Amino acid sequence: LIVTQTMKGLDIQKVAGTWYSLAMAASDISLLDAQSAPLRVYVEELKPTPEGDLEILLQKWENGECAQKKIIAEKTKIPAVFKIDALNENKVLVLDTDYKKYLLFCMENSAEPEQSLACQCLVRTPEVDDEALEKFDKALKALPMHIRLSFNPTQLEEQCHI
Numbered sequence: 001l002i003v004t005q006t007m008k009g010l011d012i013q014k015v016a017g018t019w020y021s022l023a024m025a026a027s028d029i030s031l032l033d034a035q036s037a038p039l040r041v042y043v044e045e046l047k048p049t050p051e052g053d054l055e056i057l058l059q060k061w062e063n064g065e066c067a068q069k070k071i072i073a074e075k076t077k078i079p080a081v082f083k084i085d086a087l088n089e090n091k092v093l094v095l096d097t098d099y100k101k102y103l104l105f106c107m108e109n110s111a112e113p114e115q116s117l118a119c120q121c122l123v124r125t126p127e128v129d130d131e132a133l134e135k136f137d138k139a140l141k142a143l144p145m146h147i148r149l150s151f152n153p154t155q156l157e158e159q160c161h162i
């Protein structure tokens, strides 16, 4: 348990649709440094299921090309927290959203012990939302982040933010 900011009263159905990964930050440089870095992922679309699971469409750079991926984040007993099925358990936490402009989320490694953490500022449009980025930075000020990336509008409209 490293992230202790969650969205109270989250309605997961309302996060459906298009998003842009405006900014990303990680606990370890190596998680985001290279274009093929493991957590360098660009969100395309969130697709909540009727049962309240979260299907994620995203792009990731793999083997000299921008590849599409579909991920399922299963719900928990906590509305703001989901689990991605992988070799080691990976929790997704929604920190904060207004549904209509921005959503802040982190994903963390369950046990390391120190553990890895990547967070993103998502926005609905290919625009630099300074207010959303302020909420992102304020949310991260406590967290032990060592790399931060942000994208311009031109980049946001390209596959893998080229």
Ligand SMILES: CCCCCCCCCCCCC(=O)O
Residues within 6 Å of the ligand: 015, 038, 039, 041, 043, 046, 056, 060, 069, 071, 084, 092, 094, 105, 107
């Ligand atoms: C509420 C928004 C949640 C978005 C979560 C995105 C999770 C991405 C997980 C990375 C997996 C890496 C891979 O496909 O190789």
